[PDB]
Amino acid sequence: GISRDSWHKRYKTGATQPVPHKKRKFELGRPAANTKIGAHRVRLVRTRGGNEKYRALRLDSGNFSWASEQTTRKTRIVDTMYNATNNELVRTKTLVKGAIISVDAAPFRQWYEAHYALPLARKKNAKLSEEDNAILNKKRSHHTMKKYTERQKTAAVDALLIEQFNTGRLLARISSSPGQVGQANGYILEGKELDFYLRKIRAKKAK
Amino acid sequence: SEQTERAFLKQPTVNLNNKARILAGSKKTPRYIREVGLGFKAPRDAVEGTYIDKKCPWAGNVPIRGMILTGVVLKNKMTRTIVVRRDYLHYIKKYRRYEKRHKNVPAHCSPAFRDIHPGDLVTIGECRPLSKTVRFNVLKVNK
Amino acid sequence: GKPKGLCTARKLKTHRQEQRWNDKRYKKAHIGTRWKSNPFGGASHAKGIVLEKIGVEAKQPNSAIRKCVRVQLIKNGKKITAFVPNDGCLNFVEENDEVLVSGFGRSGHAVGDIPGVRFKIVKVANTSLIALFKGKKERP
Amino acid sequence: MRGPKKHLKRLAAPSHWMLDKLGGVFAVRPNPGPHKLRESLPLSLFLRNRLKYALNYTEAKKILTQRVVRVDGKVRTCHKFPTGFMDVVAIERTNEYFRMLYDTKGRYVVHRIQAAEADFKLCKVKSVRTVNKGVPVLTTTDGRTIRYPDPHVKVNDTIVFNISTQKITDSVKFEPGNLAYVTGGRNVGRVGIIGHRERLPGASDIIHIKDSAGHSFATRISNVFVIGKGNKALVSLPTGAGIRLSIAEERDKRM
RNA sequence: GGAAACCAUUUUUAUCGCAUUGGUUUGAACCGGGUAAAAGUCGUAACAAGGUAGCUGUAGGUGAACCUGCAGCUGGAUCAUCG
RNA sequence: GCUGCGGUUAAAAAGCUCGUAGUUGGAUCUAGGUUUACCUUGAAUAAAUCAGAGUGCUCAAUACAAGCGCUUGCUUGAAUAGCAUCAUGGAAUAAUGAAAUUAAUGGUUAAGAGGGACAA
RNA sequence: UACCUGAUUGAUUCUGUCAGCGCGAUAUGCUCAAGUAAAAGAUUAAGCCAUGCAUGCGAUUCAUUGAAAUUGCGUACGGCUCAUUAGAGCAGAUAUCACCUUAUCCGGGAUGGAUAACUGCGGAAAUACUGGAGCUAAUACAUGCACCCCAGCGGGGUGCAAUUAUUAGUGUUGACUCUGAAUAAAGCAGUUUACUGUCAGCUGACUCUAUCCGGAAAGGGUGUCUGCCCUUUCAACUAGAUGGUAGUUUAUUGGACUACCAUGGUUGUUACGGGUAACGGAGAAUAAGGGUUCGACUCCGGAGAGGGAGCCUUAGAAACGGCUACCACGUCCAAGGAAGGCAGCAGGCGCGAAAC
């Protein structure tokens, strides 16, 4: 079937190569997973040596990571924004490593407010809902408040990240290979990487 | 300048986004150098540099192991790749004499070596397959 | 003169190979058409079918009629002329007989005063010509 | 082939086993285990040739099925078990103890030892690492892994291993001036004092060893096995003391 | 929730069709070359100044060898000829 | 025909010259009183076969055995020799590199090699 | 044993070949006291094959010691042949800091429901064909028995392996994005003995079976350097071709494949193409020395099982004494269907000079 053999190619000099043998099992390939956004669906693949791989055909929830804050939350993949390889993957909503996607911001906002006890760019005219109040205006002893006061010292969040949080969708990049590990774990863009990908997206939208 | 591709390239083992550094305002991006070894010194262009190349022996992830060879740069027309010509003499017993032989060894030339020209003597270290034909990395330019 | 330098091995080897082809033995043994040209196809003997009996005038200064036979080889269907040695042995050979044929001794060249004959008969009807001549065996 | 090989032709068998050429088509293939195929000896062969206790290879299995042979303090019943260098083989029924050592030629011999000697053995530290849970271990060249070794033990060193207690007793350091055994190469079976060490960084280091007879010889570090501090061997040695007799000297000694 | 037949599509892709192309072998009217073969026909080209010295290249012609023109060579039949 | 052939007449010097690859290239740096190439020595280097040590298979080709006491045994042989890589030492030969505040500051000679100039 | 002899002439000396002469391989003629070792359908037809054999042996025993059957393990080794094959394959050195592993070594981790044998009912001309009905087991199948956060009173989480990200720097290696230590989620489907026989005196000791994690060993896949036939009546070749980035696939690296981009890569030091009556090597014949020729063939490596292709099972196969199809060629049919692969041993036919 699909093969990964080096023969069947030309040589450095452009010569045709001799075929050494019939196709061997240990040099086989398999069809690509081509993971898409949708209800969870992961099939099991038996690999060489009895090991196993997890071919993710459909995925919706991704276990993403915020690096600057050093945390990891499970959010949901909303849409695909940019792909360096090809635009067809973006347009068909394909989840491949290194793909830029839009994820839910609410889990990260909840973690931030439960960890620093400060708002994350909350709306300038809207009162916090009851679930927010349960973690924001909660009241506990000064012994505990000491911990939160210490952590409030280092709490500035970049303006470019705040703008994304306002829209409620965060630009993330997939750092795993869904076709091999069966998951779409990634990390939230920030800094020069975020600026780079934002500029790419805006330029392509302008065109 | 360093970012001239369709994707953002960064050294994988460097956290460009660290809260302490960002709050301090430090624009000094840490750089990872792996110190190839075998008595090979990281070029200053590799240590203090902004280029990203995953195949550089120092700024990349290509361990050097196997054979250390020497040759003369033949052509530098590929992207970060050069062709090294190795000249030797082959002995034919029957005639008790030698004959000139040669072999071309394509090797990856890290952007650290910016002054590379056809004619310069180079040392190359064996690495894992980097491409169809490249399996060596330039380590030293003796010029 | 030949090259004598310390780094002339390639020239010496290539020249030797180039000039080996001007050697009859080497060319005869490596030309490539040996099997398709040699009637026996590189074998020592070959079985064939007798087509007719012919007489070949001996070369000068000799005078005689050498009793040869025309044979068609089974393995490739090629026609050859073979000598029937010994005296009165042409009688043992009848037309449409299966004969074993061997070379005449000089590796594809005529022998003695017989012109153009390079083969001789060894067996007729699976019987040795020498045995028939000596009377050891009789015609099947 | 299409998978692992299970046979071993007689002519492909290691020469140092000293099998006879016309003694059948096959030879006992050692199982994988503590020692390498080329540098081991099937327990079947040990009884068949070196000891002569078994006349044929059915008799070797009959002997070994009785559970009468102990290797490194454990009973072995497989006739294809790969006994190798510095292995203590104990036959309790006959109260015999041997240590598998190399002859000056480079062949396994029958070195009979006493109980005190049999209580321990030497191993070469092949690696020193840290397993899960952050606990140190050292791996020897015979496959053993020992947890919690003395932190001063490094690679290439020799460790005295107590078969009874399964513990490290002493550590001899691979440094110039210590007695050393040669296990591989053409100098196999020779014993001397470590001399100079050529430090080849990306290759195998070279060790020069001078014996008691003043003869010098080099080898690769992977073939050197320290067997004592200074000049004193921690274990006994077979008749010869690892002295490579010249070919003329051998004839003179025989006569 | 598991699941057989079945349907659709992707991939590996045997195999069959034309078509093009490479390599081997081979029929054939007829037209020629070579060689071999005791005693065929025609002449006399060459070997002596071989009876027109021989030969090289070239061109033309003639039953055939060959003849002739032009320029060379001596492997010539002259190592030489008097100022 | 490398060792090791032949080319006037026996087969064989291109009609002649220019010329790239190839091959080959003058002498010269411590005598006296940085790189290579090369050589020496080691390391790594399956048997069977070949060479070769031992050993009355009755000899031999083979084979790898066996030989001693006395019984519960001792001692044995199954040797040794047989491009590339690494290291060590050697510095002739052959290539290759260096310079156009003090110091001798730094350019071998000019081929009975070659080129160019000048004379008549 | 570093060797020659006959033959051109009326005679001579040369050049030069032919012939003789020594060994070996194959075939063959004539002929062969007893014995001892011992090659042997390679050459051509990897052509075709009648018939026999060549792969079978802990848990579960209501049959009669152990049948039958269900499990488990093996059948990927061993045997054969040399068609293909000329950066293929092999030999020596050498990586895997780019990977995968049953068997073997060292460390560490007394639950329920159904199915066969068996009984019974059947179909088919015909297979090692099978559908229903009634029981019944398991080593089959299923289930499984000091630091972080919130709050320092107290609550949670933290086994091995594993995905992603981040923190400090407990061992190593020439060097590690390796191995350790931490932190965060989450899903991941693997795993931390409901086994056999038990023995000794509530306390002990074993065999077996099952089972993951780490390191070895053994095996394998790939990578690097050097060498390895003839040919110019083959001089230019190459377009996934050479490289870059991002991905996909794989056990893993890699134009292995895809998207975008650049125009590269080999070559008179012989590329590219063609031929090979070409598997490579260890080696064999001959043999002063230097060599010439050969090597299908018992050992090592590779390849194939009529030609291709595809896959199931598995630790391991692109297996063929496994399956699936097409091509070529066969076999049995009651014409509805069912099958086959001796380049395993022995035999047969063809082919041949040539082999039990």
Swiss-Prot record, chain A:
Gene3D superfamilies named in the record: 3.10.290.70
Superkingdom per UniProt: Eukaryota
GO cellular component: cytosolic small ribosomal subunit; membrane; nucleolus; small-subunit processome
One Pfam entry name: Ribosomal_S8e
Principal place of residence: cytoplasm
Membrane topology type: Lipid-anchor
GO term, biological process aspect, one: translation
Keywords: Cytoplasm, Lipoprotein, Membrane, Nucleus, Ribonucleoprotein, Ribosomal protein
Subcellular locations according to the entry: Cytoplasm; Membrane; Nucleus, Nucleolus
A GO molecular-function descriptor: structural constituent of ribosome
NCBIfam families on file: eS8 (TIGR00307)
PANTHER family referenced in this protein's UniProt entry, alphabetically: 40S RIBOSOMAL PROTEIN S8
Function, in words: Component of the small ribosomal subunit. The ribosome is a large ribonucleoprotein complex responsible for the synthesis of proteins in the cell. Part of the small subunit (SSU) processome, first precursor of the small eukaryotic ribosomal subunit. During the assembly of the SSU processome in the nucleolus, many ribosome biogenesis factors, an RNA chaperone and ribosomal proteins associate with the nascent pre-rRNA and work in concert to generate RNA folding, modifications, rearrangements and cleavage as well as targeted degradation of pre-ribosomal RNA by the RNA exosome.
Homology family: Belongs to the eukaryotic ribosomal protein eS8 family.
Subunit structure and binding partners: Component of the small ribosomal subunit. Identified in a IGF2BP1-dependent mRNP granule complex containing untranslated mRNAs. Part of the small subunit (SSU) processome, composed of more than 70 proteins and the RNA chaperone small nucleolar RNA (snoRNA) U3.
Protein name, UniProt field: Small ribosomal subunit protein eS8
Native species: Caenorhabditis elegans
Gene: rps-8
Swiss-Prot record, chain C:
Keyword NAD set for record: no
GO biological process, one term: cytoplasmic translation
Cell compartment(s), UniProt: Cytoplasm, Cytosol; Cytoplasm; Rough endoplasmic reticulum
GO-annotated molecular function: structural constituent of ribosome
Chief location: cytoplasm
Annotated GO CC locations: cytosolic small ribosomal subunit; ribosome; rough endoplasmic reticulum
Pfam families given in the database record: Ribosom_S12_S23
Keyword Amino-acid biosynthesis part of the UniProt annotation: no
Modified residue annotations for Hydroxyproline: P61
NCBIfam families: PRK04211.1, uS12_E_A
Subunit structure: Component of the 40S small ribosomal subunit.
Family stated for the protein in its record: Belongs to the universal ribosomal protein uS12 family.
Name of the molecule in the record: Small ribosomal subunit protein uS12
Name of the gene encoding the protein in the UniProt record: rps-23
Swiss-Prot record, chain D:
GO MF, one example: rRNA binding
GO cellular component, as recorded: cytosolic small ribosomal subunit
Xref: PROSITE patterns: RIBOSOMAL_S4E (PS00528)
The keyword RNA-binding appears for this protein: yes
InterPro entries: Rib_uL2_dom2, Ribosomal_eS4, Ribosomal_eS4_C, Ribosomal_eS4_central_region, Ribosomal_eS4_central_sf, Ribosomal_eS4_KOW, Ribosomal_eS4_N, Ribosomal_eS4_N_CS
Gene3D superfamilies: 2.30.30.30, 2.40.50.740, RNA-binding S4 domain (3.10.290.10)
Record's keyword terms, sorted: Ribonucleoprotein, Ribosomal protein, RNA-binding, rRNA-binding
GO aspect biological process, one term: translation
Segments forming domain S4 RNA-binding: 41-100
Coiled-coil regions, chain positions: none
Domain of life: Eukaryota
Keyword Lipoprotein: no
Assigned protein family: Belongs to the eukaryotic ribosomal protein eS4 family.
UniProt name for this protein: Small ribosomal subunit protein eS4
Species of origin: Caenorhabditis elegans
